[PDB]
Amino acid sequence: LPQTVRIGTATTYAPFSSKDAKGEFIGFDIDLGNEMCKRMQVKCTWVASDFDALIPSLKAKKIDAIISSLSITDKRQQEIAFSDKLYAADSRLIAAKGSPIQPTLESLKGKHVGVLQGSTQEAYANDNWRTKGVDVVAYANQDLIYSDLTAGRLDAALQDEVAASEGFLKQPAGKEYAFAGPSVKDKKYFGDGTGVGLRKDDTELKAAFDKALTELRQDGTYDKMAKKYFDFNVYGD
């Protein structure tokens, strides 16, 4: 293992990764990463990036790990390796309170839908919606999506369910918005929860992460950390 492990993350996805008022990194990803590093007995430097630059930066060795709500998908496994699951992550639509919008082509054709560049939601939205007449608009960071929704530039926005819920819907800025329909289920696109993204050849680093995460889950540190953010089981199955 390196003495310093460099972890990239996109700090605009509360409550998993964001910045406090002084610019320090906060969220459940941060806590998980810092707790794993503690147990791996390495130093960890967090590195902020747009989400869609994370996997390119990992391939170029500018970072060594990604902890950024990075969903474990089949396509991504072709390019990088993953730790064991850190938590589950369903996708879901948000729109203005009272809107009839559903995550269907029939409901969304002609409306403007925000998605994060590089995400599984952009992959899904591009294939099923954008080609068929939905104005799918891709954003560099998720904060910009929420803002464009509250200004009425967007009709709806597709992102991880818990990020939307805890990072926006339950905040003042999303008081007048809600989920539009239930979770969009599509195991192909959205993957099997999130994990630490790693280079394929870094078997020893993956092993160290996987073992730290088992240890912090076994002794109950996971749940203590998660209760700061969630009143439900974020881990899943």
Residues that bind ligand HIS (CB under 6 A): 10, 13, 51, 68-71, 89, 116, 119-121, 160, 194
The least distance separating ligand HIS from the CB of residue 37, rounded to whole angstroms, comes to: 20
Largest interatomic CA distance in the chain:
53
The least distance separating ligand HIS from the CB of residue 200, rounded to whole angstroms, comes to: 18
Query: From residue 61, how far is each of 11, 55, 58, 68 by CA, in Å?
Result: 20, 10, 5, 17
Is residue 115 within 8 Å of 137, Cβ to Cβ?
yes
Q: Which is nearer to ligand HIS, 1 or 230 (CB)?
A: 230
Q: Which is nearer to ligand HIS, 69 or 128 (CB)?
A: 69
**Other beta carbons within 10 Å of 85:** 19
Is residue 125 within 8 Å of 184, Cβ to Cβ?
no
The least distance separating ligand HIS from the CB of residue 150, rounded to whole angstroms, comes to: 19
Q: Which is nearer to ligand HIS, 76 or 206 (CB)?
A: 76
The least distance separating ligand HIS from the CB of residue 7, rounded to whole angstroms, comes to: 14
Structure tokens at 202: 């870094």
The least distance separating ligand HIS from the CB of residue 70, rounded to whole angstroms, comes to: 5
Q: What is the spatial order of strands in the sheet that 112-116 belongs to? A: 135-139, 112-116, 156-160, 91-96, 177-184
Q: Which is nearer to ligand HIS, 18 or 69 (CB)?
A: 69
Q: Which is nearer to ligand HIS, 121 or 128 (CB)?
A: 121
